[PDB]
Amino acid sequence: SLAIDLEVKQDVLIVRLSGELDHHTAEELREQVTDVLENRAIRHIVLNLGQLTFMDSSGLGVILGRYKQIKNVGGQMVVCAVSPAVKRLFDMSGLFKIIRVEADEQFALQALGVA
């Protein structure tokens, strides 16, 4: 229900999600991501949501849990290729104010100077 493809480019962790993100699938994501943040010098996180077909507040929670981590190292959280539905959750929750939204992974990486 949720495929996770990770990749590191310098101090940026690229998280590519495919499928649906809810409380049921969020756990495997949290574990996988926090593992990377522990055994690597990551300052930023690019969340590629182009292949994500669904997300609820649990998706916002896992993102927000990471945001706190990234904020601790002075880095930035970037989400890209966001669906209108997911964009609706970011506006309504004000997350659009603390997390940058970009068109796609390339522009997101460019914004972080790693492309």
Binding site: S57, S58, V62, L64, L89
Partner: peptide, 14 residues
């Protein structure tokens, strides 16, 4: 805790 605290707000908005 990974809680977004958005649940009810989303329900109320949608």
């Amino acid at each position: 805790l990974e809680r977004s605290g958005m649940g009810f707000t989303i329900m109320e908005n949608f």
